Amino acid sequence: GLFGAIAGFIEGGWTGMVDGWYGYHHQNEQGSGYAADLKSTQNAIDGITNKVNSVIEKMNTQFTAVGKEFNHLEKRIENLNKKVDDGFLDIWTYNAELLVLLENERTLDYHDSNVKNLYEKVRSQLKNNAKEIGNGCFEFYHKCDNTCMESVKNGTYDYPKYSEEAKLNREEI
Amino acid sequence: IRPKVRDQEGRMNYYWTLVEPGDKITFEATGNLVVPRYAFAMERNAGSGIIISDT
Numbered sequence: 001g002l003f004g005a006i007a008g009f010i011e012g013g014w015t016g017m018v019d020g021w022y023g024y025h026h027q028n029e030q031g032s033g034y035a036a037d038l039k040s041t042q043n044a045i046d047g048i049t050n051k052v053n054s055v056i057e058k059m060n061t062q063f064t065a066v067g068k069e070f071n072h073l074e075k076r077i078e079n080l081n082k083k084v085d086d087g088f089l090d091i092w093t094y095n096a097e098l099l100v101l102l103e104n105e106r107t108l109d110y111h112d113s114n115v116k117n118l119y120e121k122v123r124s125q126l127k128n129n130a131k132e133i134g135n136g137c138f139e140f141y142h143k144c145d146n147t148c149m150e151s152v153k154n155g156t157y158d159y160p161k162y163s164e165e166a167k168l169n170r171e172e173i
Numbered sequence: 174i175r176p177k178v179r180d181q182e183g184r185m186n187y188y189w190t191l192v193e194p195g196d197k198i199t200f201e202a203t204g205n206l207v208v209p210r211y212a213f214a215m216e217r218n219a220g221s222g223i224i225i226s227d228t
Contacts, residue, residue, distance in 0.1 A: 066222020 003112035010136040129166040141166035
């Protein structure tokens with residue numbers, strides 16, 4: 001992708017995550033499970049909502065009619081009517097197809113950036129208390145219970161709390 | 174004696190008009206006229222159109 005997160009170091013997605021678009025998977029002594037990140041998912045949904053609304057809101061319904069047919073004398077104007085309808089038809093078809101193709105790639109890249117920032121927020125939070133094992137995973141060098149797991153997700157994580165606990169395991173190897 | 178269609182060399186050009194409520198239609202002629210028999214009181218609605226389809 002453009003940001004290298006989706007189909008990048010994270011090769012595949014989670015089918016078990018059915019509560020949000022982006023989230024975490026934890027594995028501690030108490031148990032394991034999926035949990036979506038609320039901040040990233042809700043903002044993304046509103047952003048894509050605004051993107052879709054930005055396209056279709058102005059495209060309002062029009063009153064149409066067959067109109068008067070053209071007699072033999074009304075040939076030149078009939079050709080002009082064909083010219084304008086075809087001209088608008090060609091322009092609208094080209095613009096609609098082009099906009100969808102361009103915006104779809106931007107939409108895909110939007111998810112790529114949202115996933116990447118989530119990984120960086122965790123990566124910057126943990127710092128040396130975890131190991132980057134790849135595929136978006138973080139092997140903790142210390143003991144992380146459920147409270148510790150949620151602290152990273154809520155953004156209220158404390159590096160000094162497990163600094164010495166991890167450091168002993170870092171210097172172990 | 175123009176080229177006859179439907180085995181009639183004679184022709185009949187059809188005209189129409191909408192007489193406004195409260196108006197006369199003076200039909201004056203000396204010959205070669207086809208007079209109306211049935212009229213149509215009506216109130217138009219919008220443009221709409223004619224769908225030339227066999228659906």
